[PDB]
Design an enzyme around this catalytic site. Sequence first.
Site, short mmCIF file in Angstrom:
data_model
loop_
_atom_site.label_atom_id
_atom_site.label_comp_id
_atom_site.label_asym_id
_atom_site.label_seq_id
_atom_site.Cartn_x
_atom_site.Cartn_y
_atom_site.Cartn_z
N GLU A 124 0.85 -1.20 0.00
CA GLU A 124 0.00 0.00 0.00
C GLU A 124 0.89 1.25 0.00
OE1 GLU A 124 -2.86 0.46 3.12
OE2 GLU A 124 -3.84 2.11 2.09
N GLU A 268 -2.97 -3.95 6.70
CA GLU A 268 -4.03 -4.92 6.75
C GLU A 268 -4.04 -5.98 5.64
OE1 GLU A 268 -4.27 -1.57 5.82
OE2 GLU A 268 -5.87 -1.29 4.37
N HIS A 301 -7.46 -1.82 14.56
CA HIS A 301 -7.56 -1.09 13.29
C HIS A 301 -7.34 -2.04 12.09
CE1 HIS A 301 -6.90 2.66 10.78
NE2 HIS A 301 -6.29 1.75 10.03
N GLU A 302 -6.19 -2.74 12.10
CA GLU A 302 -5.94 -3.61 10.96
C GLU A 302 -6.96 -4.73 10.82
OE1 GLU A 302 -3.99 -2.04 9.16
OE2 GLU A 302 -2.85 -0.87 10.63
N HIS A 305 -10.21 -3.38 9.21
CA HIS A 305 -10.05 -3.26 7.78
C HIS A 305 -10.46 -4.52 7.02
CE1 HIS A 305 -8.21 0.59 6.70
NE2 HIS A 305 -7.12 0.38 7.39
N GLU A 324 -10.11 4.54 5.59
CA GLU A 324 -9.39 4.95 6.82
C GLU A 324 -10.25 5.68 7.79
OE1 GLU A 324 -6.84 3.50 7.48
OE2 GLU A 324 -5.96 2.88 5.68
MG LIG Z 1 -2.75 1.73 7.46
ZN LIG Z 2 -5.85 1.86 8.03
#
Ligand SMILES: [Mg+2]
Ligand SMILES: [Zn+2]
EC number: 3.4.11.-
Length: 890
Positions: A124, A268, A301-302, A305, A324
């Site tokens: 990414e 992620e 967070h990951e 996702h 995000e």
């Molecule tokens: Mg990130």
């Molecule tokens: Zn993220």
Amino acid sequence: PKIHYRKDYKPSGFIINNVTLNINIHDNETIVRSVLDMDISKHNVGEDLVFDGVGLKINEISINNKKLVEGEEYTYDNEFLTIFSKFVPKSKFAFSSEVIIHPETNYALTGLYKSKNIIVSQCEATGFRRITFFIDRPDMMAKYDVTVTADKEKYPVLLSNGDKVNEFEIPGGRHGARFNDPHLKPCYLFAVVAGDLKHLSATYITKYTKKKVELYVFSEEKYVSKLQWALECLKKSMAFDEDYFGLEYDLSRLNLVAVSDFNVGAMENKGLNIFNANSLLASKKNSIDFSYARILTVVGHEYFHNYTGNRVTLRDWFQLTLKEGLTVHRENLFSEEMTKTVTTRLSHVDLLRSVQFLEDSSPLSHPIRPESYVSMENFYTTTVYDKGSEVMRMYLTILGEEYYKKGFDIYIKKNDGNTATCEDFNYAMEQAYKMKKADNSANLNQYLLWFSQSGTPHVSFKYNYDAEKKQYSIHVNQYTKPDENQKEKKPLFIPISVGLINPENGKEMISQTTLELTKESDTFVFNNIAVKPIPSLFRGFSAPVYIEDNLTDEERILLLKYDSDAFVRYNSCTNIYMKQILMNYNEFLKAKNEKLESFNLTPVNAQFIDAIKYLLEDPHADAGFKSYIVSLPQDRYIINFVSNLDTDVLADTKEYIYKQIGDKLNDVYYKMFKSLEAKADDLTYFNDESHVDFDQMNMRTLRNTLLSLLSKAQYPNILNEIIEHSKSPYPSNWLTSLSVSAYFDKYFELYDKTYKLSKDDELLLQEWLKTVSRSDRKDIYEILKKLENEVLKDSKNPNDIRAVYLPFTNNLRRFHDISGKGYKLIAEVITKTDKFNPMVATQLCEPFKLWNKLDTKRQELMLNEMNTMLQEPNISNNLKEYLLRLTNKL
Ligand SMILES: [Mg+2]
Ligand SMILES: [Zn+2]
Ligand SMILES: [Mg+2]
Ligand SMILES: [Mg+2]
């Protein structure tokens, strides 16, 4: 510079359906063979076939087993591979390439690289094109079959996304493993890892379907013990997405991997999330408290996702906030549930109003859905993340939990297995809004301006009470300053969560209610209001705005003491501080510019100090909350309110205010520092890496905040407390002892003591570097030179570089030295770093973002250093775009 525009989005003329990779790792090269099973889309017009491919060495190119030759059937310029249209088939075809890459010399940490003895990827946003040719954009979704081979002794563990479907031996001491990822994905979600990794594991059974999922967390051998809290956080994350959102994990296995060299916190990749070791590894003997919160947040967070980004992905990179903002919102909901502390939401607010507000008033200001970019990596910003999260949270405030959940479901199900855009999300939410209002003509068309309009709204209030009629009004106005993105700003849909507090008895007067402001101004009227209230506005910080409460300090004090809402209490405190800071700053500034021989300072409000004492002494009030009330607002918050800021005047102002208050409260602070010890430093759970008491952690933060205040004050005999605190088993305490010892001759003894305690754990040593860097030392420049020579040396590890320099840049008095020497030092580090890691270099530009807020001498010094950096030969596109935009050239 080459610029990409949101309005120019078009679907590709090509389709990539399957990707079959063989990644053969050797000592001095990695060979990547890739077969792309492709087709022609309904948008094709017989164009050339153009692949992204950056820095690849071509061994072979073919289509349908026809070798293609440079200059005859293709061109390659080290950035784009162009297959001329005559040689592009008109129906399904197989494109084959073999390239050579070099992870061992990839110090940019994008693409395939080596981090210590681990080979790892980061794709990414646009890193996959540094591994092999692709149409490297997130609407090109495909299925992946990945084989990795390597030396078995060096690289015994081989991972890629999805199911491990075979493992085999290869002559010459090599081995391979093959992975099949059955879920369609964009290439930015590809990952591979090869290393001598150790693991912890567990089995998780999904809530509704009862699927067995094998959870693995991995690190280098030295640090395997530090994996336990991350594994627990993963189980917490899975359960939260099941419980709140009804979402279950969708593979038989999930792997998390820590690597030492990482440009951001984590990533992620499907089934194979890869983390900066600072955001995965902790142990209670070897980590500060804040590591625990950081790991909970980054793991969550990951994980989140997996649906908001993976199962529903992006149509294009302009839609970044769709994954995000939404994911940050999900992780904030999760962390507020897990921690059960009011300081969690407060910390998110503090972040936004300091860093993001600064951004949004800077030349870098952008809407959360940008209109253009050169390097997409420059748009992974606090705007896109944090303002995005607040825009995603406003939908929950507007709809309530039940209807929010319904809209979310609509979105996640309709777009599953596909790309989406910000509009898709807004449309799902609009469906839920029609249902909540029982009116199929209600619409959220105005809401879209939160995606397209830059800048922070300012919301202001006036109040009126009619005692005879028992009727109260709140008149509200919104204003957004025109900027380079819109010369004319429009009013937003701003949800204003409100209560009304009776100043007589401190009690709630209305059921909380959320005012829906949609015009530039509006007046909201309340009947049956028995006495003139004090309004409690924007509860929970219900929109991402500048609030002008138009309250007196006496009113603000009453809310600080008696309101129910943590944010409003904290904000009321903040506003009393701001009014003081501005007034004293102006008094000092006038004295300085007029060269006065004597002048006055407005003292700190005495009733406000009494209120602080009352709160601190209340055994039933919250320890984390208390540490926010004794702290002045962040310098980056304050700077949003001052033009032509003289940083030295500001430092003088803060020192005066702190000293006013400590001259009244230091005995209370000392008494509390002692009284909190037993509960704060109790060792329940010290050997349990699956459980953290966040309230207890807040008690430690309060103690360490008080110790700093008493140490700067030179409170009598406090050096004794400092020395004792250095013997605590909690690294948060013993590193605090180093920081607070800055005001004493013992600093260098504690520097050595704590260095010794820190030097044998990579991450603890980085925390020691930050502690030194942040130290309030007159000799900070000589200390930085000592760190460079004795500890940093020529490390290319972003965590080491960031630890040495970034805290020091927050030193208001020393970084902003009127000589410009702080600006020059960091500009040299930026330019040094940009030669190997452009993303890290742009991170290290952060302190320059406020340049045009400063007094004109410091503006000039900063501008000279930014223009010097822009002149450097072979400057990266990342840094060049960043600095051109920041200096009003792009
Ligand atoms: Mg990130
Ligand atoms: Zn993220
Ligand atoms: Mg190369
Ligand atoms: Mg190292």
